[PDB]
Amino acid sequence: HMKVKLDYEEVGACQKEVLITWDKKLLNCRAKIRCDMEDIHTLLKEGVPKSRRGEIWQFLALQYRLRHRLPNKQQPPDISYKELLKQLTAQQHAILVDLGRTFPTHPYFSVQLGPGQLSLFNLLKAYSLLDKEVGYCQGISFVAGVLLLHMSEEQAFEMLKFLMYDLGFRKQYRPDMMSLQIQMYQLSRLLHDYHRDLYNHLEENEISPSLYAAPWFLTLFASQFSLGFVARVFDIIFLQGTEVIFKVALSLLSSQETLIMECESFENIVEFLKNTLPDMNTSEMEKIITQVFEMDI
């Protein structure tokens, strides 16, 4: 279906040249070894075509998969996607009742219990079984959604596993919320060490990251921002890792940070960062994306 699938905004904004280069790389043999980082990094920087963005991500994954390897202990049990779906999931209710809410205005996922909602269910179902500890959490679907949107159901389950396990994302989604509390603090400390004034203004009005970033993290910005935007953030998620999140959050806060300031009450501030800050216009996104690219820590 791809066509209707990849039907969305853009941000990527590829120029033919870039489209060719990528085309070359992705075919210059596929099971090689660490093609030079700076190129894929720069390529990723100059632009990723939505038509191939599907392959690219998987590709990137491959590389990271050679340049790293998981310790067989934290490795995800060995079970076929197919044979993973042959069991019953404890999280039915919860999964179903969320199928409609994930990317609802999107063609693919619009139709009531249609093909889209269907696949998005299997993914969420299956993963619920495999990673039994995490099971199903409100959001992991946006992840699984965005993935489903750029590749076969089966392929998507593959990346999902990678993302969650390899690139270690399944962390935050664990039940004790212990890792989430720490990612939060880290974003807090991060603001402080770079955007003091902005940090102080938020610390004064007792605005803890948890009030405005949990969503960002848990849905990787999908639950609030443009898919096309979320699609870029994903390009670097497949490259750099469990942190592009911070870079984005950081970058984004200080992108329009010229504006919280004005607001004095949480009600005014909060309702701006959560309901206004995300309604950007390409021009402001084109930059924040790139700033995250060359944003260094």
Side-chain angles (χ1 to χ4, degrees):
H1 329 291
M2 297 310 282
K3 191 34 60 184
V4 64
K5 263 182 182 173
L6 317 191
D7 186 55
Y8 63 91
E9 48 237 0
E10 243 305 332
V11 336
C14 290
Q15 289 188 294
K16 348 196 60 268
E17 347 276 19
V18 78
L19 218 352
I20 314 295
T21 309
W22 268 119
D23 261 302
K24 195 175 179 182
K25 233 311 206 305
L26 272 62
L27 74 82
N28 257 127
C29 206
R30 256 191 58 199
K32 350 235 292 189
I33 304 302
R34 2 194 298 165
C35 284
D36 237 275
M37 274 311 86
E38 88 180 309
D39 284 2
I40 37 184
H41 179 289
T42 193
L43 271 176
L44 247 298
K45 181 176 180 175
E46 253 67 50
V48 187
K50 69 158 58 172
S51 59
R52 311 201 69 74
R53 150 135 56 226
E55 215 140 45
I56 296 186
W57 289 350
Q58 308 177 207
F59 155 60
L60 288 175
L62 212 186
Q63 296 296 168
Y64 181 110
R65 207 92 90 162
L66 316 158
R67 281 86 74 63
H68 258 294
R69 281 187 177 69
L70 225 158
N72 275 44
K73 185 178 183 175
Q74 292 74 190
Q75 280 263 53
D78 192 273
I79 338 186
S80 182
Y81 178 42
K82 295 175 187 177
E83 190 114 359
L84 228 184
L85 294 162
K86 289 183 177 177
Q87 303 170 58
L88 280 60
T89 325
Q91 333 284 119
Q92 293 172 211
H93 279 158
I95 291 179
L96 304 151
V97 74
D98 282 336
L99 283 165
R101 292 204 172 196
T102 315
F103 303 138
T105 92
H106 182 77
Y108 197 65
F109 301 104
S110 70
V111 301
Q112 238 325 59
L113 224 42
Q117 300 213 320
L118 281 195
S119 307
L120 177 66
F121 165 83
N122 293 92
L123 298 192
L124 287 162
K125 162 200 173 72
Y127 186 96
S128 175
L129 291 186
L130 176 171
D131 176 29
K132 356 232 178 187
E133 317 81 77
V134 172
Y136 177 91
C137 183
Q138 226 302 70
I140 179 172
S141 58
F142 291 110
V143 176
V146 165
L147 289 175
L148 192 57
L149 263 170
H150 308 67
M151 62 179 105
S152 108
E153 194 182 311
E154 187 122 50
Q155 304 174 311
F157 189 49
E158 220 49 26
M159 294 310 87
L160 187 66
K161 253 177 302 182
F162 171 166
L163 233 346
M164 294 298 280
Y165 279 2
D166 290 51
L167 295 174
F169 263 106
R170 60 179 304 285
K171 42 50 188 263
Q172 61 182 307
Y173 298 13
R174 289 200 309 275
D176 52 71
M177 283 182 268
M178 211 19 155
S179 192
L180 191 66
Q181 280 169 167
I182 288 178
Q183 307 194 316
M184 289 293 126
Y185 161 62
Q186 281 171 286
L187 177 53
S188 196
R189 143 281 231 284
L190 227 74
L191 283 171
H192 171 284
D193 299 4
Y194 289 73
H195 307 292
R196 218 79 150 292
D197 67 305
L198 182 57
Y199 169 53
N200 292 307
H201 177 39
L202 292 168
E203 173 179 60
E204 192 183 305
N205 291 80
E206 304 309 327
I207 290 186
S208 178
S210 295
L211 296 164
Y212 74 88
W216 290 349
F217 289 172
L218 289 302
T219 63
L220 313 202
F221 300 112
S223 71
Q224 289 173 296
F225 304 70
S226 327
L227 286 292
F229 173 61
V230 171
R232 272 302 261 171
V233 176
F234 264 60
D235 303 333
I236 20 189
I237 309 288
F238 277 116
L239 182 58
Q240 304 185 316
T242 66
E243 42 170 59
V244 183
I245 300 178
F246 289 108
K247 294 195 186 180
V248 177
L250 207 64
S251 183
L252 217 45
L253 289 191
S254 93
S255 191
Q256 209 67 53
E257 122 276 319
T258 295
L259 17 171
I260 142 173
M261 322 291 219
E262 179 202 65
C263 315
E264 272 303 312
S265 299
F266 340 87
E267 199 180 3
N268 300 301
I269 299 182
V270 167
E271 267 159 44
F272 137 77
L273 305 193
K274 325 209 58 58
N275 310 175
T276 302
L277 185 162
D279 59 37
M280 296 166 255
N281 42 207
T282 306
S283 294
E284 192 74 312
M285 297 196 59
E286 163 81 298
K287 287 186 176 181
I288 186 286
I289 281 298
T290 190
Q291 265 172 38
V292 162
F293 261 74
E294 47 197 36
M295 191 187 101
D296 182 277
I297 302 185

